[PDB]
Amino acid sequence: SEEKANFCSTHNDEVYARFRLQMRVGVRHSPLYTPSNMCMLDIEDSVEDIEESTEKEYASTATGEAAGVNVSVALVGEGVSIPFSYIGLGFNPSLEDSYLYVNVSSRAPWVKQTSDLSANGGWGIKQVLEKELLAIQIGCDNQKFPEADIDFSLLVDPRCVTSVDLHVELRDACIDYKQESPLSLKGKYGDGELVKKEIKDVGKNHNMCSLNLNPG
Amino acid sequence: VTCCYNFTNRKISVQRLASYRRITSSKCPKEAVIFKTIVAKEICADPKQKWVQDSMDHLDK
Ligand SMILES: *[C@@H]1O[C@H](CO)[C@@H](O[C@@H]2O[C@H](CO)[C@@H](O[C@@H]3O[C@H](CO)[C@@H](O)[C@H](O)[C@@H]3O)[C@H](O)[C@H]2NC(C)=O)[C@H](O)[C@H]1NC(C)=O
Numbered sequence: 363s364e365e366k367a368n369f370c371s372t373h374n375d376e377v378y379a380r381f382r383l384q385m386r387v388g389v390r391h392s393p394l395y396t397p398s399n400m401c402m403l404d405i406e407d408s409v410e411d412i413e414e415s416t417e418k419e420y421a422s423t424a425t426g427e428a429a430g431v432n433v434s435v436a437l438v439g440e441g442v443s444i445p446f447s448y449i450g451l452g453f454n455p456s457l458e459d460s461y462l463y464v465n466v467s468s469r470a471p472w473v474k475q476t477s478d479l480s481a482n483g484g485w486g487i488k489q490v491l492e493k494e495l496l497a498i499q500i501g502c503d504n505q506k507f508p509e510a511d512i513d514f515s516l517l518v519d520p521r522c523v524t525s526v527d528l529h530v531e532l533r534d535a536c537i538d539y540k541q542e543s544p545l546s547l548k549g550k551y552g553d554g555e556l557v558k559k560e561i562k563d564v565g566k567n568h569n570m571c572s573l574n575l576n577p578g
Numbered sequence: 579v580t581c582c583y584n585f586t587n588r589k590i591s592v593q594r595l596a597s598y599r600r601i602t603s604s605k606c607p608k609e610a611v612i613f614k615t616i617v618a619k620e621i622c623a624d625p626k627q628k629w630v631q632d633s634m635d636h637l638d639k
């Protein structure tokens with residue numbers, strides 16, 4: 363990439379975080395689910411003050427609803443902002459059991475500068491390794507039914523979720539131009555490599571919707 | 579209604595938490611406790627782990 367290489371060469375002593383999530387959710391519908399192409403997407407950043415701490419709590423939250431399912435991905439840091447810039451969904455609108463695909467990515471540093479987590483003797487890196495939380499939640503809309511490791515919580519409503527498979531990474535943005543980096547976290551649930559492959563070729567047979575935030 | 583399929587491993591400081599509730603439903607596979615953080619996102623935690631049981635004690639007081 364043209365923008366990328368210039369950045370990573372001109373910023374070789376720094377570390378910029380880059381979060382990427384690829385998730386596949388097995389979907390089932392209530393008998394009264396009406397097929398819909400509707401897609402809802404959102405990205406929200408929040409800041410909370412901690413009591414005994416001097417460090418503010420920063421959250422970025424990406425949400426998507428399609429196919430009767432609503433997804434929530436929250437990345438929370440103590441003193442460190444990693445904001446989402448992108449959420450994409452791949453979904454089948456029909457009643458049939460299908461897979462819902464979710465991409466979530468954080469802002470690339472070359473587009474708009476995130477914080478150098480290597481500053482002050484890698485203070486930012488220590489905060490991420492020690493404090494960062496990932497909370498993924500998955501629910502069923504208003505459907506009515508008949509009556510190194512990233513530290514991540516996965517919370518799902520099983521009435522509409524038959525399976526979850528995900529790969530998630532939080533890594534040095536420019537790790538391709540480095541032999542090593544102190545920032546390299548990874549997470550799996552189920553077949554993470556599989557979803558990382560599949561999700562690149564679902565536009566052929568799925569509705570696709572996405573939200574990309576204003577760069578700059 | 580909701581089940582914990584994956585747990586937060588490390589202990590979060592009590593200050594970062596806010597509210598708490600348990601999950602003992604037949605529908606869910608593993609027992610679990612769900613903490614609500616300040617930023618209003620829920621976190622799955624394993625009750626078979628002292629740091630969680632101690633976090634529950636603090637919230638009660
Ligand atoms: C997926 O969508 C459902 C439906 O929108 C979300 O569940 C619902 O969340 C709302 C909050 O907007 C809940 O309403 C709340 O009711 C309680 C009283 O019981 C009250 O404390 C709050 O002030 C608020 O009015 C609602 O109970 C809840 N469930 C349903 C069936 O509507 C769900 O949060 C979404 N899931 C994800 C992962 O985002």
Ligand SMILES: *[C@@H]1O[C@H](CO)[C@@H](O[C@@H]2O[C@H](CO)[C@@H](O[C@@H]3O[C@H](CO)[C@@H](O)[C@H](O)[C@@H]3O)[C@H](O)[C@H]2NC(C)=O)[C@H](O)[C@H]1NC(C)=O
Binds near residue numbers: 465563565566
């Ligand atoms: C999640 O993110 C990945 C990576 O950015 C996305 O992968 C991209 O998938 C699209 C189509 O699904 C690929 O499109 C390409 O262009 C034409 C479209 O007509 C197609 O005929 C080509 O055969 C080719 O697939 C694109 O190459 C691919 N990008 C990368 C870098 O692998 C994916 O769309 C996202 N998933 C979502 C939003 O669900």
